[PDB]
Every structure is written in structure tokens, then in C-alpha cells.
Write a protein that binds this ligand. Structure first.
Ligand SMILES: O=C(O)C1=C[C@H](O)[C@@H](OS(=O)(=O)O)[C@H](O[C@H]2[C@H](O)[C@@H](NS(=O)(=O)O)[C@@H](O)O[C@@H]2COS(=O)(=O)O)O1
Lengths: 65, 67
């Protein structure tokens, strides 16, 4: 029920704890900066750099379900 | 330096004025966003993007600041 789009303007500096992430999604291409959003169990939407190794690894684990 | 949590931005503006009585709050999207924008929060808690340059948008804001 919202017309807004979540975008990222900064990336979290250190790897987020894997245990508390329930899913992820890529921010819209409309956004100026590319980004991966890790959603935590407390519904925090954390921005991360798609080029980081840990980020790609977390995505892989979330993709294997 | 800035929050690493997602921030809402607008990429489209509602074409015509929303019913004034259905609006309870408003807020400008971050200056970090590509487009300047006003987001009106309706009483059903929906969020609508609007153009700050529009006359009705500025008037709605002036009204909201009174209530
Ligand atoms: O209380 C807020 O509404 C608010 C809190 C956060 O500090 C930040 O949210 S955000 O990281 O998702 O954007 C935001 O603070 C500022 C925001 O940084 C400003 N944009 S900027 O000048 O480009 O940096 C602008 O949008 O105003 C926000 C709130 O102003 S404040 O209430 O005085 O802090 O919003």
C-alpha cells in the first residue's frame, strides 16, 4: 500500500550475523546505487555491497534454501 | 556517512490531488534520493508520492502544519 521504493545510500561495514537473516532482495534498478538488502528476523532492512564476498556467499546460502 | 538501512524514495508522482480529508501526515523523502518528493500518509496508512512543485501539494502541507 505504498508508492515508495527502498533504496540504499550506504553499505553495512561488517558482515551481518547470518543466523538472523530470513531473506534478501536486490534494490530496484531505479535506485542510483546497486545493492543487496538482507532482511533480519526483526525486519531490519540492511544494505550490503553486492560485490563483497560474504554478501555473495550469504545470497548463495539463501538461494539453496 | 549515512544509514546503511534502506531509505524510501519516489520515482513517480500521483497525477491528481488526493482527497485532503484522507491525509493525516506527510514527510519529504531524503535529499539522497534522485527526485525531491512529498509522501502523504493517508488515514488507511497508505503512502503516496507527490510532487513538491505542485500547488496543491504545497497547500496540503501548509494545511497539515496547522492541524
Ligand atoms: O526521524 C526521521 O524521519 C529520519 C531519521 C533518520 O535519521 C533518517 O532516515 S533515513 O536514513 O532512512 O533517511 C532521516 O533523517 C533525515 C534525512 O537524512 C534527511 N535527508 S538528507 O538531508 O539528504 O540527509 C531528510 O530526509 O530529513 C530526515 C529527518 O530530518 S530530522 O527529523 O531532522 O532528522 O529521517
Amino acid at each position: 500500500s505504498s508508492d515508495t521504493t527502498p533504496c540504499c545510500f550506504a553499505y553495512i561495514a561488517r558482515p551481518l550475523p547470518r543466523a538472523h537473516i530470513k531473506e534478501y532482495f536486490y534494490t530496484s534498478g531505479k535506485c542510483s546505487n546497486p545493492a543487496v538488502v538482507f532482511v533480519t528476523r526483526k525486519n531490519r532492512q540492511v544494505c550490503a555491497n553486492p560485490e563483497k564476498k560474504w554478501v555473495r556467499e550469504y545470497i548463495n546460502s539463501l538461494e539453496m534454501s
